[PDB]
């Protein structure tokens, strides 16, 4: 019995590989050679956020590009005003080892997670004025790696248990679960349409999951080592992954294969964070070399380097309106670039 | 400037003052990471220090200074990821069962992996060889010989500069010193000297256990200061 199952699995894998290779008529590089080059995209630091005490691990932009939430390994969530630099709120967290934070699409709620396995959603519009723990949902058997809001009532969170789960804030229980990953889930990103979401795990693979249907539609295995970060392409048809090999890989959710592999010899440090600009041309990826590099999605060449930090760039993000870029590092300083 | 903007700047200054105030309490308390396999008696060591939670925090004050010991034992077996969060920490407490020769190899391998970690190449590792009484009783009974698992033990001689405690059987002292030397050699392997190991022998009734952690943390902080002040 088990032998037949193994043979069937091997045959299915071989068939999938053959079908994927058959669609490789031409690489994205060959098609992106006639387009003009992006040129040296030089960037300057506009704001310096000296408020955080300890390593800044995660940050996210709200619906308004002027609001900025950031989490540090000291248990503090500081809401930053990117224009005037004024601190809007300071939330003393219960768990000090927070690794992820999220800003709701409505701006009224913010979530976070870490080694405590608990996700405490903080309401910023409380009638009492002071921020209060709205729903401290739990149930995961591992550290939380990433959190993203689908709506004011639903929130999806990834955990080291190798299974993602979509939670109902009102009910406070697991609405649906997503299983199949072999390694701990490292990152998660929502599509622009909120229909599908993609997450990466410790294994060298990434899968696409549907919000309505609790099942994966596609699976990618083009990575060579542990995949750390993942981000959806601005159109929702493709995504890029960061791994511990100094090479970014752009995966398409329609061709089901890697389009371009952004790699360089001198770059050997692992990728910690990845993000996309509103136009998708400028692909920003954070490296452990205490600096961030910009990669042209089409030309695949290095568009620029952000070396303003002096420690591992742990997180980065582009505003929704396309006006600035934020970067976080373990040096407790968050710099905004434009 | 508008009144609303001025009040917002005032609130931002208040939040900055609060953050600066909390910074003192943060930098004043020392954070410690507790690591060890399921077979290790780390639980007993934690319970003794009375001076699905993926994280367990333990605050204990010793010599007018607070120590924050964090232990992770309710997560998946793989740890190469969440171990990175505990960088820039004061010290790492590694507990190993010196009595169980079977799991001893696994403990040595885990200690070697932790020591050679890229992100922990600057964090000192405090090593407590727990269950010394069990190891002593086992080596006295003669039923389980270390040679069956480590052939080098047979050709290992007790260190000349050793200081056997009063009432310690020769075999027990030799075995514990062999384990100590093995751990020190595993730590020195590819060691750049940026961090140092602090091996100590602990028991299940020993009351003077927190003093060892205090001394190790003090020495680590002194070395870090000497490094920052460009004195060494």
């Amino acid at each position: 019995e088990l032998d037949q199952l193994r043979q069937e699995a091997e045959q299915l894998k071989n068939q999938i590989r053959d079908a994927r290779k058959a669609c490789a008529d031409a690489t994205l590089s060959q098609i992106t050679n006639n387009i003009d080059p992006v040129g040296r995209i030089q960037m300057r630091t506009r704001r310096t956020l000296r408020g955080h005490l300890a390593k800044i691990y995660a940050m996210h932009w709200g619906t308004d590009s002027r609001l900025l939430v950031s989490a540090s390994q000291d248990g503090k969530l500081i809401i930053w005003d990117s224009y005037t630099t004024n601190k809007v709120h300071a939330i003393p967290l219960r768990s000090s080892w927070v690794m992820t934070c999220a800003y709701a699409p409505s701006g009224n709620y913010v979530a976070c997670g870490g080694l405590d396995n608990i996700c405490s959603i903080y309401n910023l519009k409380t009638r009492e004025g002071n921020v209060r723990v709205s729903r401290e949902l739990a149930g995961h058997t591992g550290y939380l790696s990433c959190c993203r809001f689908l709506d004011d009532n639903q929130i999806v969170t990834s955990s080291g248990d190798t299974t993602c789960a979509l939670w109902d804030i009102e009910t406070g229980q697991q609405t649906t679960t997503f299983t199949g990953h072999t390694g701990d889930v490292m990152s998660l990103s929502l599509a622009p349409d909120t229909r599908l979401f993609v997450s990466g795990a410790c294994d060298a693979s990434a899968k696409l999951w549907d919000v309505r249907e609790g099942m994966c539609r596609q699976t990618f295995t083009g990575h060579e080592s542990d995949i750390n970060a993942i981000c959806f392409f601005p159109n929702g048809n493709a995504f890029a992954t960061g791994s511990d090999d100094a090479t970014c890989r752009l995966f398409d959710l329609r061709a089901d294969q890697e389009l371009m592999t952004y790699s360089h010899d001198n770059i050997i440090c692992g990728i910690t964070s990845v993000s996309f600009s509103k136009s998708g041309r400028l692909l920003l990826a954070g490296y452990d070399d205490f600096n961030c590099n910009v990669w042209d999605a089409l030309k695949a060449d290095r568009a620029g380097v952000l070396a303003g930090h002096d420690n591992r760039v742990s997180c980065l993000g582009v505003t929704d309106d396309g006006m600035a870029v934020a970067t976080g590092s373990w040096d407790s300083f968050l710099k905004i670039w434009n | 400037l508008s009144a609303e903007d001025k009040a917002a700047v005032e609130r931002s200054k208040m939040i900055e003052k609060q953050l600066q105030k909390d910074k003192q309490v943060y930098r004043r308390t020392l954070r410690l990471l507790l690591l060890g396999a399921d077979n290790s008696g780390k639980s007993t060591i934690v319970k003794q220090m009375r001076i699905t939670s993926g994280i367990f925090e333990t605050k204990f004050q010793v010599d007018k200074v607070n120590f924050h010991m964090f232990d992770v034992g309710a997560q998946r077996d793989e740890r190469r990821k969440w171990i990175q969060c505990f960088n820039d920490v004061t010290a790492i407490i590694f507990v190993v069962d010196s009595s169980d020769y079977n799991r001893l190899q696994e403990a040595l391998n885990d200690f070697k992996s932790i020591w050679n970690n890229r992100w922990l190449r600057t964090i000192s590792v405090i090593l407590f060889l727990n269950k010394q009484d069990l190891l002593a009783e086992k080596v006295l009974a003669g039923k389980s010989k270390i040679e069956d698992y480590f052939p080098e033990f047979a050709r290992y001689t007790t260190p000349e500069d050793a200081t056997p405690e009063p009432g310690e059987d020769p075999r027990v002292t030799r075995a514990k010193y062999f384990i100590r030397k093995e751990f020190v050699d595993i730590s020195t392997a590819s060691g750049d000297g940026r961090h140092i190991c602090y091996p100590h022998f602990t028991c299940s009734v020993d009351t003077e256990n927190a003093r060892r952690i205090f001394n190790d943390c003090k020495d680590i902080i002194l070395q870090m200061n000497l490094r920052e002040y460009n004195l060494v």
Epitope: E224, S225, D226, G270 | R76, D77, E78, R79, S113
Partner: nanobody, 128 residues
Framework: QVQLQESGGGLVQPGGSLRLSCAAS????????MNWVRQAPGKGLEWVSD????????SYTGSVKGRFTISRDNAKNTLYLQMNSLKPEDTAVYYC?????????????????????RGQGTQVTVSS
């Protein structure tokens, strides 16, 4: 797609000699460190030896020191573990393992629960 392949094994006589041959594809084998682990019926994973990228650094476990010899050939992306002598105790499935990163010295492939970069394993039954 990263995938590992293993060859060699079966039944062997006590004190005999046998070589385990494994291969991998989908990554720069020359950059990743290789380790070996065994799993006997009822016992967990046990590390036996490892070999660095260039092979300049090699180590063996006390229970297998001297009897086994590990080697690698980056020219064809192959790993070898030569066993000159065998005892009834070493009867176990030998699993090959890869380093989690191509430019690091630390390894965590000893996880007994699951690991994404280990082979399928080949049984080695040694007995009279």
């Amino acid at each position: 797609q990263v995938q590992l392949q293993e060859s060699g094994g079966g039944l062997v006589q006590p004190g005999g000699s046998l070589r385990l041959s494994c291969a991998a594809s989908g990554f720069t084998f020359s950059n990743y460190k290789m380790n070996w682990v065994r799993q006997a019926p009822g016992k967990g994973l046990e590390w036996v030896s490892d070999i660095s990228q260039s092979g300049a650094s090699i180590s063996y476990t006390g229970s297998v020191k001297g009897r086994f010899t590990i080697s690698r050939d980056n020219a064809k992306n192959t790993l070898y573990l030569q066993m000159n002598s065998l005892k009834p105790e070493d009867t176990a499935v030998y699993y090959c393992a890869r380093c989690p990163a191509p430019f690091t010295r630390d390894c965590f492939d000893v996880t007994s629960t699951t690991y994404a970069y280990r082979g399928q394993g080949t049984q080695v039954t040694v007995s009279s």
